[PDB]
Amino acid sequence: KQTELLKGILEGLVLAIIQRKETYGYEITKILNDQGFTEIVEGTVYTILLRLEKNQWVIAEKKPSEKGPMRKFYRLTSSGEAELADFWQRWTLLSKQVNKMKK
Amino acid sequence: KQTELLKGILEGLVLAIIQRKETYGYEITKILNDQGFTEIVEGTVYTILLRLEKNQWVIAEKKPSEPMRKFYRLTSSGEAELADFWQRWTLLSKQVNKMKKN
Fold first, then answer.
1. Is the dihedral of CA B70, B80, B95, A46 positive or negative?
2. Residue ranges of the Transcription regulator PadR N-terminal domain (chain B) (predicted)?
C-alpha cells in the first residue's frame, strides 16, 4: 500500500521540489529522503522525471556539477507550475475529506 | 492524476466505512460519492472488496436490505489494517503539508 499511497502524490512533491530550486535526481531524492520519504529510491524519481519531461511540465538541461561531471538539471515550465498549483488544491481537498473520516 | 491520488487511500476508506457500519457494494460506492470522491464507479469498489475478501481483512454474508445483498464486516486482521492505514496516513499528510508550507 505504501507504493500505492505514494502514487499521484510523489509526482506532486517532485514538481514542488523543482519549483523551489533547480535540481537533479540525486538532490531531489535526497530531499524527499530527509522529509522523510525514506523508502523512495532515485530509480523511482528518475521514472517520474522522464514522465514530467515527456509532458513538458519540466525542462531538462545539462550543466557541470560541484565538482566536475555533467548532470541533468530541471526547472518548472509555466504549464508545470500550473500542474503544481492544481496538485496542492486537489490535495488540500482530498486531505480534508480523508481527515474528516479519521474522527 | 486523481485516479492515482485515490490509490492506496481508497482501500482504507472502504475498510474505514465497513468498520462504522455493516454495508454492501452499491451502498459503499454511494457513501463514498457523498463524501466525495466523485470519480468512483462501483466497479472500483467491487474490485477493492474482492481483494479485501481474498486477503481475509473482511468477511461477507448474504442478507436482506432496506433485496438480498452481500454484507461485509471487518475481521480482526482487517481491523489492524485500518489501524495501520491511519498511522501511515497521519504521517504521510504531516510530511506532505510540511512541504506545501515549506
1. negative
2. 14-83
Q: How far is B84 from chain A (nearest CA, A)?
A: 10
Residues in A closer than 8 angstroms to B19, CB to CB, are none
Q: Which three cell numbers stand for residue A70?
A: 555533467
Report resolution (Å) to 1 decimal: 2.7
Q: For the residues of B39-96, what is the DSSP string, one character each?
A: S--HHHHHHHHHHHHHTTSEEEEEEE---EEEEEEE-HHHHHHHHHHHHHHHHHHHHH
Which technique was the structure solved with, according to the deposited record?
X-ray
Tell which CATH classification among 3.20.20.80, 3.40.50.720, 1.10.3720.10, 1.10.10.10 matches the domain A1-103. 1.10.10.10
> Do the Cβ atoms of B4 and A5 come within 8 Å?
no
**Residues of A with Cβ-Cβ distance to B83 under 8 angstroms:** none
Q: Which CATH architecture has domain B1-102?
A: Orthogonal Bundle (1.10)
Q: Closest approach of chain A CAs to the CA of B18, in angstroms?
A: 12
